Design a protein around this nucleic acid. Structure first.
Ligand code: NA
Length: 636
DNA sequence: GATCTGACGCTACG
DNA sequence: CGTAGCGTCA
């Protein structure tokens, strides 16, 4: 009533007073209101409606009486986002004051609490439009209770606001988040918005307290929170793709698919669903009985084992590959398109490993290596990453963390031989020197295939699981791969020692911790079932490495983003992050100056205090550049 | 009839 | 190990 005001209808003196209130505010509590009107506080993942406006609660306390006279205390202000039916000058004015207020929200010195902060920051960033760049939201820090709850319990599915209230909030606080226009009135909706914003503040404070109790607070403030505006920028941008070339490629792969289907039907001597694993299993073992020769599944390991026994496995392999490419990396990528470009949706709450996840399309899972197709009705090379092209004039600048998992494992284990390997620098093709040291065969004899074996051999180690894939990915029988693994294991003892320490810690504390303090509770480490316990054990050792590497990647992301954020020259925009790799879109003449800053910043992550972290191994960064994500020539 | 849906296989990425 | 996404089938 007097607690809720549309800022468009304020008198100008009241507008100025409002700006000053925002500057002097103790805290700001924010939520997005949709056209329902519902909020982020209600229960939907998708609100199935457009953003209408933004509601901000301005808290004068977290000293003395205050009478503004144009509002009560503490007031809720409403900022219209959604465009009117007709654009005119008054809309321009409204937009001007709105932009001023929202920016005041972005740069204010008080705590800002928002349930989903990335959404808010994205909305605001798009609302600025031409009046603002991505660097305006760069310094924003929202307090996101969902990210807090995630840091505490990363396993649990992403809870609603109400769930978080019933869980971390004490006590007997009941909220009504489900009001909309038409199930209720405007006054009910608004009243509930105000009350629930207060509750949201309370909850956020409690969750901060908990984060301090579990020792997650420094991680929260410094890693997760500053990452929020960075995801919003990436979602606001778009990467241009080629619709035509993709349609052609789609048609071609369709043709080849038809060919392989006909072949498969021919050599199995029956007509069966080519995309059915059940039928293929029945065929492979049911009839041909290839397993008795020299039921098991249809996985690539099995099929690579049988490749010499019969034609069908090789056919199924090629078909599976081509079908994957066409279907996910061409046809599915066209469905994500808007206006000739695509933009992935990022999720910070996605994993238990602390890694980011991406959607629509999944840009982290796009095949790195191009494939070859025996063109049906010349050879044909197909690179899905070549479909991603930079704007003009602009060019992609990639920064990779070289052997990051291996270096993390070296740090954690402290193995003398690996540490000796990395601290002679660069002398890279580190996997070659590793092959030589491991296999005791001197350096030159080491070939590219041995480098590959070494890398596969490593990754299989760091990640695990293991004998089976290693074999499938390496192109060698399972037993040979397992032998390689065991050799590698007794060559470096401190790795087994490290895993053993990690499992012991997991049994002791009931949960395992990464480098920067990210925690992975694993209650099944205390389980009586042996496969569950052994699973938990397998999960801990993985979480240490994967979690640590995720921490480092996020940290690099933040530091580079911040470095470019304050530069009066560089316009370089962070486009994507695929795990170990950062993908930037940089204006051409800025390439040399930008690559320098990126390299220098990421390599400076070896020692960053606080965080406490210091590394026993230096971080080598590999820079690349090119007009297409598919073709990137090495740089420097 | 005709679609649809939850549960599982497979394997790209790291 | 653990993400997304595309595919069956009862
Ligand atoms: Na008006």
């Amino acid at each position: 009533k007097k607690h809720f005001c549309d800022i468009r209808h304020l008198d100008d003196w009241a507008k100025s007073q409002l700006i000053e209130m925002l500057k002097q505010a103790a805290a700001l509590v924010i939520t997005v209101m949709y056209t329902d009107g519902s909020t982020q506080l209600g229960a939907d993942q998708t609100p199935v409606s457009s953003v209408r406006g933004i509601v901000v609660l301005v808290k004068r306390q977290a000293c003395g009486p205050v009478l503004e006279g144009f509002v009560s205390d503490d007031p809720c202000i409403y900022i219209q986002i959604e465009h009117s039916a007709i654009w005119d000058q008054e809309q321009e004015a409204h937009q001007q004051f709105a932009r001023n207020v929202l920016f005041q929200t972005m740069k204010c010195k008080c705590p800002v609490i928002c349930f989903n902060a990335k959404d808010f920051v994205r909305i605001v960033l798009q609302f600025f439009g031409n009046d603002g760049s991505w660097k305006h939201v760069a310094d924003f820090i929202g307090l996101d209770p969902r990210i807090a709850a995630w840091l505490i319990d990363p396993s649990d599915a992403t809870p609603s606001f109400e769930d978080l209230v019933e869980k971390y909030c004490e006590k007997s606080i009941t909220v009504k988040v489900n009001s909309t226009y038409g199930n209720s009135s405007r006054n009910i909706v608004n009243q509930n918005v105000r009350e629930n914003l207060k509750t949201l503040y309370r909850l956020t404070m409690d969750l901060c307290s908990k984060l301090k109790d579990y020792g997650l607070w420094q991680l929260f403030r410094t890693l997760e929170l500053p990452l929020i505006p960075i995801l919003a920028v990436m979602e606001s941008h778009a990467i241009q793709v080629n619709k035509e070339e993709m349609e052609k490629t789609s048609a071609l792969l369709g043709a080849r698919l038809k060919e392989l289907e006909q072949e498969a039907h021919f050599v199995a001597g029956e007509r069966f669903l080519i995309t059915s694993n059940n039928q293929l299993r029945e065929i492979l073992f049911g009839k041909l009985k290839l397993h008795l020769l020299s039921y098991p599944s249809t996985s690539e390991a099995v099929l690579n084992a049988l490749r010499d026994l019969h034609p069908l496995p090789k056919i199924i392999l090629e078909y599976r590959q081509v079908h994957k490419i066409k279907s996910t990396f061409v046809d599915g990528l066209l469905a994500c398109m808007k206006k000739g470009s695509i933009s992935s949706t990022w999720n910070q709450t996605g994993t238990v490993t602390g890694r980011l996840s991406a959607k629509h399309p999944n840009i982290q899972g796009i095949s790195k290596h191009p494939i070859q197709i025996t063109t049906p009705k010349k050879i044909l090379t197909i690179s899905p990453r070549a479909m991603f092209v930079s704007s003009k004039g602009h060019t992609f600048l990639a920064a990779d963390f070289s052997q990051i998992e291996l270096r993390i494992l070296t740090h954690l284990s402290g193995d003398p031989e690996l540490l000796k390997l990395f601290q002679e620098s660069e002398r890279d093709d580190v996997f070659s020197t590793l092959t030589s040291q491991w296999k005791d065969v001197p350096v030159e004899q080491v070939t590219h295939a041995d480098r590959e074996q070494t890398k596969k051999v490593v990754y299989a180690v760091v990640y695990g699981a293991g004998k089976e894939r290693l074999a499938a990915c390496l192109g060698v029988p399972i037993q040979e791969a397992a032998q390689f693994l065991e050799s590698f294991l007794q060559k470096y003892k401190k790795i087994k020692d490290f895993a053993r320490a990690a499992i012991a810690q997991c049994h002791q504390t009931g949960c395992v911790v990464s480098i920067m303090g990210r925690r992975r509770p694993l209650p099944r480490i205390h389980a009586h079932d042996q496969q569950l316990r052994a699973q938990a054990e397998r999960q801990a050792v993985n979480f240490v490495v994967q979690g640590s590497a995720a921490d480092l990647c996020k940290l690099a992301m933040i530091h580079v983003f911040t470095a470019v954020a304050a530069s009066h020259t560089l316009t370089a925009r962070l486009v994507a992050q695929i795990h170990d790799e950062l993908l930037f879109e940089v204006e051409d003449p800025q390439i040399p100056e930008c690559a320098a800053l990126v390299r220098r910043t990421m390599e400076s992550l070896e020692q960053v205090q606080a965080l406490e972290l210091q590394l026993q191994v230096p971080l080598k960064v590999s820079l690349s550049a090119g007009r297409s994500w598919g073709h990137l020539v090495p740089l420097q």
